[PDB]
Amino acid sequence: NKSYKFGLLTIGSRGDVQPYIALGKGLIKEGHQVVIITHSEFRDFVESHGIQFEEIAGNPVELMSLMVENESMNVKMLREASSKFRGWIDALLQTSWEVCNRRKFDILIESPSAMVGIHITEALQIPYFRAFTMPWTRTRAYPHAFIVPDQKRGGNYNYLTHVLFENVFWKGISGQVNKWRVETLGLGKTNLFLLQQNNVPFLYNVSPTIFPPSIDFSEWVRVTGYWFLDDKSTFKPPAELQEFISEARSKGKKLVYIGFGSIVVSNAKEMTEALVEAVMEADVYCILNKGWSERLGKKTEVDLPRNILNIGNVPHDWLFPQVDAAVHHGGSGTTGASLRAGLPTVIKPFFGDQFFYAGRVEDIGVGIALKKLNAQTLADALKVATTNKIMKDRAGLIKKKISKEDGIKTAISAIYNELEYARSVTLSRVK
Amino acid sequence: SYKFGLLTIGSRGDVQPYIALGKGLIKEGHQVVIITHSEFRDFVESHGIQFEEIAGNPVELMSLMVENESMNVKMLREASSKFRGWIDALLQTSWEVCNRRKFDILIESPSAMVGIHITEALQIPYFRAFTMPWTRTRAYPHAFIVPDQKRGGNYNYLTHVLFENVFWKGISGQVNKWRVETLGLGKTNLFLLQQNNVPFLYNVSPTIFPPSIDFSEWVRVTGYWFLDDKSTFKPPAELQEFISEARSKGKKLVYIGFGSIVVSNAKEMTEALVEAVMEADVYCILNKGWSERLGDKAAKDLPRNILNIGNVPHDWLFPQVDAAVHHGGSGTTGASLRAGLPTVIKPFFGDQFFYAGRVEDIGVGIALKKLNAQTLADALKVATTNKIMKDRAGLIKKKISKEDGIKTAISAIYNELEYARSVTLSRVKTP
Ligand SMILES: O=c1ccn([C@@H]2O[C@H](COP(=O)(O)OP(=O)(O)O[C@H]3O[C@H](CO)[C@@H](O)[C@H](O)[C@H]3O)[C@@H](O)[C@H]2O)c(=O)[nH]1
Ligand SMILES: O=c1ccn([C@@H]2O[C@H](COP(=O)(O)OP(=O)(O)O[C@H]3O[C@H](CO)[C@@H](O)[C@H](O)[C@H]3O)[C@@H](O)[C@H]2O)c(=O)[nH]1
C-alpha cells in the first residue's frame, strides 16, 4: 500500500535467516525499508543481498555449546547451564529492545522462537506478525514441532502438545520477561491470558503440499508457500564439482546428495564410514556436504573414494535439479529445496521439527524416514529413492505444485491484507 | 513393628509390586495398607492386605486425551475444569485416609503427587518407589522424555530438570491451596521440596536398570517385586490343547499382548499381526486389548495357529513359551526377562520407550519403531531363532533369579529409615 519500515527479527541458524532475506528482498521491491535483526555471524549474508542488518544476541549455538562440552560434576553443570541460560535470555531481551526502540519500525515480523516481539510491539504500539517454518499454533492437525510423537497420535493429543509447549515456554521465561517488561519497556506484567498469542497473524513459510492448512486454523493463520532465496544467479561452480557431476553421468551412475547440516555426534569417523559403505553398496556417486563432528569445530577424516566428493555448501537451487535423490536431516528449508526440485528424499531426523518433516515426507509418499542410520538402512533407502517409480512420480507432482506457488508474493499480500488486523491485535494488549 | 501405608495411582502394574512388597512386610511383622483406586480392592484384599480407597484414577483423564477431534477452546476449558476436579478429589481422599490411619511410614509412587506433602503435615518418614527413571541422573533420560536415539549425559540430566519443573508447575496452584487450607502447612515450591533428597526404591532389576555412579546413596535399585500367582492358576482346556499342538507340530510359541491401548484402526492392526504370525510360521497366544475407543474389544477371523486368550498370569505362561511381543510396560518387561524370553517391544507411551531401548541395548530383544506385517515377521524370526539372543535371555534370567527384590527393598527401608525421618523433618516448620 505505501512505504513502511519493517524489522524482521529472528534467532537461530541459516534456515531461520535465509527465508527472511528472501522476504526482505521482496519487500524492498515493493518500496519498503527492511532491517533484518539477527546474530552477527549473518551480517555479511544479509548485507550481500542489499538488506540492512542489526545485531542481537540470543544465538542458540551458545546454549548447545554448554550441553555438549560441560563435564563438571552434575549440580555444577546444572548451575552453570541455568546461569548461562539466564544471561543469554537477558542479553536477547536487552539487545532486541535497544534495536527496536532506536530504529522505530512501523512493522515487526518475528520468528516466535525469539520470544521478544509480542512485548516490544506492545510497548511501541505497532503491528506485529509471526512467521515460522514448523508447527507452532494450536491445532489438532499437527503436534507441536518440539513434541512430535514417535508415531502419529490423535487430534486431541496434538492439540494438547501445543497447550503444553506454550505453557512450558512461557513459564520458563516469564520471570525474566516480566522484569524487563516493567523495568525496561514501561509495561505491566503479563501472562498467557493477557498475551492472547493465538490472535497474532501467523505466516507459515512452507508449502501447503507438505503442510496443508488444517480445518481448525484461524483465519489469520496462513500457509504461504516457501520463501525461496534463488541464489543460482551469481553462483560460479568450482571446476571439481562440474567434472564430478559429468563423470557420474558419463559412467551411468545415479547421483545423490548427502548432507545433514551442522550436528554433533558421538563418533564422526564411524558415521562417515557408514555413509561410504552405503554409497558403495548402492551403486551411486555421492556429493557429500559434511557438517558433523564430535565438538563444534575439521571435515573429511578418512580417505574418500572416487565416487564421493566432499564439497562445501553449494546452493541447493543449483545442485538439486542435477541429482537423482537427496539424503538429509529434514530441516524445514532443506526439505523445501529437495521437494522444489522433485527429488525422492531420504530423511534421518536428529532434533525437533526434523521429526515432523521426516513423517510428512513418508505420508506424502515422496521419501523415506530413517529411524536408524547405518550402512544397511541407508543402502536400502538409496536403492528405493533412486529406482522407485511411484516415489519419483509423487516427487514430480509435488515439484509441479510448488512451482505454481509464489510464497513471497503470497506472504506480502497477506501482510497488506492483515495489516489493520495486526495493528488492532497489538492495541488490544495496550492497557 | 511399623504401620506402612503404600500409596499409588495408575493401573494394575502400579499396584501389583506393592502387593508383593506388602506380603513381605507382613511376614516381617509389620502392618500394611495399600491405598489406591476402588477397582483394585478385590485384588489387594485377595492377597491378605488391607485396602483404602483414593480417587485420582488416570482412566478419567485418558478419556479427554485420547478422543479424536473434540479439542478446541471450549473443550480445553472443560478439560481444565475436569482436571482441576480430578486433582482435588485425589488431594482430599488421600489426606482423609492418611490423617485417619496415622501411618508410621508412607511409601508412594511419585506419580501420585500427594506423599511428600502429607508426610510433611504428619511428620513421618517418606519413601518413593517407582519402576521407571524419575531421579536426576546423567545415565538415563526422564521416563517421559526419552529421545529418539541416545543423547549425552547432560541432555539426560536436563530432561529430568525439565520434567520436574513441568510436573510441579502444572499442579502447584492446587497443591498449595490444599497445603494451606487443608494440611495446615505453608506454600512450597521445587526449591523447598528438595525432591531429590527423598529415599527412592527403583523396584526394577539392576540388569535392566543399573545404578549410575551419580545416583545418591539413598537411591536404590532393588530388583523387581514379583507377586508369584502360578501355583493357583488352572489353565482352561483350549489353552492346554493349543500349547500341546504347537509343540507337537514343532512350531515356536510366542505370546503377543500390548495391554490396553486405543489405536487408529483396530482391524488393520489385527490383520498385520495375523500376516506376521503366518509369515514367521509360529503359534501365537494373543492377549488382545486394542480398540478404536476405550469400550471393550478383547474379542475379534483368526486362524488355527492363533489363540485369543484373556489375561493369564505371566509367571505361569511365560515359562511355557519361546518368545514374547509386548508394549514394554515395566512390569511386563520384568516378567519376560525373568522368564528368559527373547522380547520384541513395540512401545506406545511413556516409559515403554525407555524399556524398548534397554532390551535392545542388553541384547535380549528388539525394539520396533514401526509395527506392520513385515517388521513384526522379521522380529519374530530373530526372536525365535537367534541363538545369541536366546543365550543372552538365559543369562539375564539367571541374574534376575539371583536377586531378591523384596528382601533387598525391606533391608533398604530399615537402613534408610532414620535418613527418611530426617528428610521429612527438614521440610517441617521449626516451632
Ligand atoms: O549446502 C547448502 C546447505 C543449505 N542450503 C540451504 O540453506 C537452507 C537451510 O535451511 P534449513 O534446513 O531450514 O536450515 P538448517 O539451519 O540446516 O536447519 C535448522 O533450522 C531449521 C529452521 O529453524 C530447522 O527446520 C532445522 O530442524 C534446524 O536444524 C535451505 O534453504 C537450504 O537449501 C544450501 O543451499 N546449500
Ligand atoms: O495377561 C496378563 C497381563 C498382565 N500381567 C502382569 O501384570 C503386570 C502389568 O504390569 P505393567 O506392564 O507394569 O503394567 P501396565 O499397566 O501394562 O503398564 C502401564 O503401567 C506401567 C507401570 O506404571 C508402565 O511401565 C507402562 O508403561 C504402562 O503402560 C505385569 O506384572 C504383568 O506380567 C499378567 O500376569 N498377565
- HEC readout, B274-310: HHHHHHHCCEEEECCCEECCCCCCCCCCCCCCEEECC
The one-letter code for the residue type at B27 is K
Equal fold, B3-224+403-427 vs B230-402: yes
Q: Tell how far the Cα of A96 is from the centroid of ligand 2, in angstroms.
A: 51
Which three cell numbers mark B337? 526377562
Interchain pair A160, B71: CB under 8 A = yes
| Maximal CA-CA distance, chain B | 75
Contacts of B158 in chain A (CB under 8 A): 67, 78, 81
* Residue found under cell 552477527: A40
**Cα(A12)–Cα(A21) distance, rounded to whole angstroms?**
14
Is B266's Cβ below 8 Å from some Cβ in A? no
Q: Cα A189 to the chain's mean position, in Å?
A: 31
Q: Which residues pair with B220 in a beta bridge?
A: B201
What cell does B388 get? 545369541
A296 touches chain B (CB under 8 A): no
Which residues of A make up each annotated binding site? Answer: 13-14, 16, 289, 313-314, 316, 329, 332-334, 353-354
Calpha distance A125→B212 (Å, rounded)? 54
The C-alpha atoms of residue A132 and residue A119 are separated, in whole angstroms, by: 18
Q: Give one word for A332, left, alpha or beta, with left for phi > 0 and alpha for psi -120 to 50.
A: alpha
Distance from CA of B313 to the nearest CA of A (A): 30
> DSSP state, B180?
I
Q: Which residue does chain B place closest to A138, by CA atoms?
A: B72
Sheet arrangement for strand B343-345: B306-308, B283-286, B253-257, B323-326, B343-345, B365-367
Whether A216 sits inside 8 A of B369 (CB atoms) is no
Indicate the residue of A74, A151, A172 with minimum beta-carbon distance to B138: A74
Is B109:B7 a contact under the CB 8 Å cutoff? yes
C-alpha A99 to ligand 1 mean position (Å): 26
Class at the top of the CATH hierarchy for domain A239-404: alpha beta
Nearest protein CA to atom 3 of ligand 2, as residue: B311
Ligand 1: atom nearest CA of A334 is: 12
Q: Do B71 and A155 touch (CB under 8 A)?
A: yes
Q: Is the CB of B330 under 6 A from ligand 2?
A: yes
Residue B287 CB–ligand 2 contact under 6 Å: yes
Cell of B9: 495411582
Q: How many CB pairs under 8 A join A and B?
A: 69
Q: Hey, where are the domains in chain A?
A: 5-226+406-429, 239-404
DSSP letters for B364-383: SEEE-SS-SHHHHHHHHHHH
* Amino acid letter, residue B330: S
Q: How far is CA A377 from the centre of its chain?
A: 26
- Give all strands (DSSP E) within B91-239, no chain letters: 105-108, 126-130, 200-202, 219-221
Residue A11 carries which DSSP code? -
- The burial class, CB within 10 Å (0-12 / 13-18 / 19+), for A117 is buried
Fold assignment, B3-224+403-427: Rossmann fold (3.40.50)
Phi, psi dihedral angles at A217 (to 5 degrees)? -65, 135
Question: Is the CB of B13 within 6 Å of ligand 2?
Answer: yes
**Cell 549440580, residue located:** A75
| Ligand 1 pocket test target in A13, A16, A299 with most atoms within 8 Å of CB | A13
Tell the CATH topology of B230-402. Answer: Rossmann fold (3.40.50)
Instruction: Show Cβ contacts of residue A189 under 8 Å, excluding neighbours closer than 6 positions.
Output: A178, A181, A182
Q: Do B136 and A171 touch (CB under 8 A)?
A: no
Q: Determine, for residues A67 and B148 on separate chains, whether the beta-carbon distance falls below 8 Å.
A: no
Given a contact cutoff of 8 angstroms between Cβ atoms, the answer to whether A425 and A201 are in contact is yes
The beta-carbon neighbor of B154 closest among A77, A154, A216 is A77
Q: Long-range contact list for B228-233, CB < 8 A, 24+ apart?
A: B228/B20, B228/B315, B229/B313, B229/B315, B229/B316, B230/B313, B230/B315, B230/B316, B230/B319, B233/B312, B233/B313, B233/B316
Do A68 and B138 lie within an 8 Å CB cutoff?
no
Residue A129 near residue A422, CB atoms below 8 Å? yes
Structural fold of domain A5-226+406-429: Rossmann fold (3.40.50)
Judging contacts by C-beta atoms under 8 Å, the chain A residues touching residue B154 are 66-68, 70, 77, 81
Q: A245-276: b or e for each residue (b if 16 or more CB lie within 10 Å)?
A: beebeeeebbbbbbbbbeebeeebeebbebbb
Distance in angstroms (rounded) separating the CA atoms of residues A76 and A59:
23
H or E segment and range at residue A107: strand A107-110
Q: Is A77 in the B-facing interface, judged by CB distances under 8 Å? A: yes
For residue A162, the SS3 value is: helix
Check CB contact of B68 with chain A, cutoff 8 Å.
Answer: yes
Residue type (1 letter), B11: S
Phi/psi zone of residue B376: left (φ > 0), alpha (ψ -120 to 50 degrees), beta?
alpha
Interior/surface letters A7-34, b for 16+ CB within 10 angstroms, e for the rest = bbbbbbbbbbbbbbbbbbbbbbebebbb
Would you state the cell numbers that stand for residue B231, as one nine-digit string?
501355583
A160 lies within 8 A of chain B by CB: yes
Q: What residues contact A107, with CB distance under 8 A and at least 6 apart?
A: A4, A5, A6, A7, A126, A127, A128, A129, A415, A419, A422
Alpha carbons within 13 angstroms on the beta-carbon side of residue A398 total 32
For A129, list phi and psi in degrees, rounded to 5.
-125, 145
Distance CA A10, CA A58 (A): 9
Contact B344, B376 (CB under 8 A): yes
Would you say B6 and B44 are in contact if contact means Cβ atoms under 8 Å apart?
no
Distance separating the N- and C-terminal Cα atoms of chain A: 29
Residue B338 CB less than 6 A away from ligand 2: no
Strand ranges of the sheet holding B126-130, from the earlier edge strand across to the other edge: B50-53, B31-36, B3-7, B105-108, B126-130, B200-202, B219-221
The amino acid present at A12, given as its one-letter code, is: G
Question: Measured from the CB, is residue B331 less than 6 Å from ligand 2?
Answer: yes
User: Nearest residue of A to residue B71 by CA position?
Assistant: A156
**Alpha-helix residue ranges (DSSP H) falling in B30-152:** 41-46, 59-66, 73-101, 115-122
Q: Round the CA-based radius of gyration of chain B to a whole number and report it.
A: 22
Say whether residue A155 is in contact with chain B using an 8 A CB cutoff. yes
Is some CB atom of chain A closer than 8 A to the CB atom of B46?
no
Q: Is the CB of A12 under 6 A from ligand 1?
A: yes
Query: What ligand 2 atom has the least distance to the C-alpha of B350?
Result: 27
Resolution to one decimal, Å: 1.9
Asked whether the beta carbons of residue B157 and residue A68 sit closer than 8 angstroms, the reply is no
SS3 at position B213: coil
> Cell 503442510 maps to which residue?
A211
What gap in Å lies between CA B391 and CA B388, rounded to an integer?
Answer: 5
